[PDB]
Enzyme design. Structure first.
Site, PDB file in Angstrom:
ATOM      1  N   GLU A 192    -114.785   6.540  36.385  1.00 30.91           N
ATOM      2  CA  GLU A 192    -114.149   7.242  35.272  1.00 30.91           C
ATOM      3  C   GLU A 192    -115.218   7.725  34.331  1.00 30.91           C
ATOM      4  O   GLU A 192    -116.062   6.942  33.890  1.00 30.91           O
ATOM      5  CB  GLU A 192    -113.154   6.308  34.559  1.00 30.91           C
ATOM      6  CG  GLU A 192    -111.998   5.867  35.472  1.00 30.91           C
ATOM      7  CD  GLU A 192    -111.222   4.706  34.894  1.00 30.91           C
ATOM      8  OE1 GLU A 192    -110.476   4.911  33.911  1.00 30.91           O
ATOM      9  OE2 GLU A 192    -111.395   3.576  35.400  1.00 30.91           O
ATOM     10  N   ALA A 193    -115.192   9.018  34.046  1.00 27.45           N
ATOM     11  CA  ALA A 193    -116.193   9.707  33.212  1.00 27.45           C
ATOM     12  C   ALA A 193    -116.446   9.124  31.851  1.00 27.45           C
ATOM     13  O   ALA A 193    -117.616   8.944  31.491  1.00 27.45           O
ATOM     14  CB  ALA A 193    -115.854  11.202  33.113  1.00 27.45           C
TER      15      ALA A 193
END
Length: 355
Positions: A103-104
């Site tokens: 997840e960024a």
């Protein structure tokens, strides 16, 4: 070698490796009874008990946006001694201390924590500010993808001169030393990063080679850059009290992971909350994050968040591919909530005489 926290450590490893919340609760419980600092103790256990803990769960706790999480991450990074240490060796080591979330926003927080602490331990020696440390780190991570992604042909790979140009004046208005950058460029070229990512992310994940043609996906994608439109035009099943905010993606995160942003859904009545992350593959991101678009739907902490996230996931014609437990919810509870919403939709369509 008995230490005051030895008994706690042995208990926590068990609890944590089953459910991280149960492990964290015990550290909270012990720190309360023994008059100790929950933040420092958690970071100490994560750091010292690396070889014994589920590193996915450690990575997830450290990368999560939470009041406790943010304090623990700061204390965790402080355990590393980066004083007079080689920049790249320090970054490699940090990245191996946990399993990187897929997840960024989580990867971003972990990277920012590294840069700040490395700068603080080597104040104005090679790096002039925490911002310069952060830009250097993200540019190095992108350089790693560029030099080692085979879809980027030998003739198209970023040159050392091109790295220098990207970083010109980013060292708090000044440049980084030429050899300081040459050493990073050469070492990364010779040895890519060992990046251990999680297999699946918490919550619901929709991902397939056909997801980009799903009517809901297309509407969701457009919703990221639209203004004053209701989320019910995207998800009919969630009601009319749902408000939204959009966290736009940082450019480098888009390149790195295919990140397109996060929509936060809040029910005005119930306080139910859900986040929706969108990823679309690109030539850079595919090397590490696959060739398929992705949608990650996660329920928040509040009661009825599970049902809001499940309704959003069930509104897609595409099925949910991956289910994973969240820090708060069991995988079985997310599965039951989603399957039930799918069953209700099927009954409603049949009863209204829809083909």
């Amino acid at each position: 070698y008995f230490q005051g926290d030895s008994l706690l450590k042995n208990e926590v490893i068990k609890l944590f490796n089953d459910k991280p919340k149960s492990g964290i609760a015990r550290i909270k419980k012990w720190c309360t009874d023994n008059n100790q600092d929950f933040i420092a103790e958690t970071a100490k256990i994560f750091y010292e008990e690396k070889s014994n803990l589920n590193l996915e769960f450690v990575g997830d706790y450290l990368g999560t946006d939470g009041v406790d999480n943010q304090k623990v991450l700061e204390s965790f990074t402080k355990q590393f001694d980066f004083k007079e240490k080689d920049y790249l060796e320090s970054l490699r080591r940090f990245l191996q201390s946990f399993k990187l979330p897929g997840e960024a926003q989580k990867i971003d927080r972990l990277v920012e924590s590294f840069g700040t602490h490395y700068y603080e331990q080597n104040l104005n020696i090679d790096i002039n500010s925490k911002d310069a440390a952060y830009i250097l780190a993200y540019q190095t991570i992108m350089l790693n993808t560029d030099l080692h992604n085979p879809s980027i042909a030998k003739s198209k790979k970023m040159t050392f001169e091109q790295l220098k140009n990207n970083l010109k004046g980013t060292n708090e208005s000044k440049n980084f030393n030429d050899n300081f950058l040459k050493k990073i460029y050469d070492e990364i070229e010779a040895k890519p990063f060992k990046l251990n990512f999680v297999k699946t992310s918490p919550g619901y994940e929709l991902t397939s080679t056909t997801l980009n043609k799903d009517s809901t996906f297309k509407k969701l994608d457009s919703f990221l850059h639209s203004t004053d439109v209701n989320i019910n035009t995207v998800f009919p099943g969630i009601g009319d009290n749902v408000k939204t905010t959009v966290d736009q993606p940082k450019s480098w995160l888009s390149f790195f992971t295919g990140y397109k942003g996060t929509i936060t859904l809040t029910d005005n009545k119930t306080s139910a909350q859900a986040t929706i992350q969108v990823y679309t593959p690109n030539i850079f991101s595919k090397w590490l994050f696959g060739e398929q678009p992705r949608v990650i739907i996660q329920p928040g902490q509040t009661k009825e968040s599970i049902d809001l996230a499940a309704k959003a996931a069930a509104d897609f014609s595409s099925p949910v591919k991956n289910f994973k437990a969240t820090y708060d919810y069991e995988v079985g509870d997310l599965i039951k909530a989603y399957d039930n919403q799918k069953k209700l939709i099927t009954i409603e369509r049949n009863l209204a005489l829809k083909e």
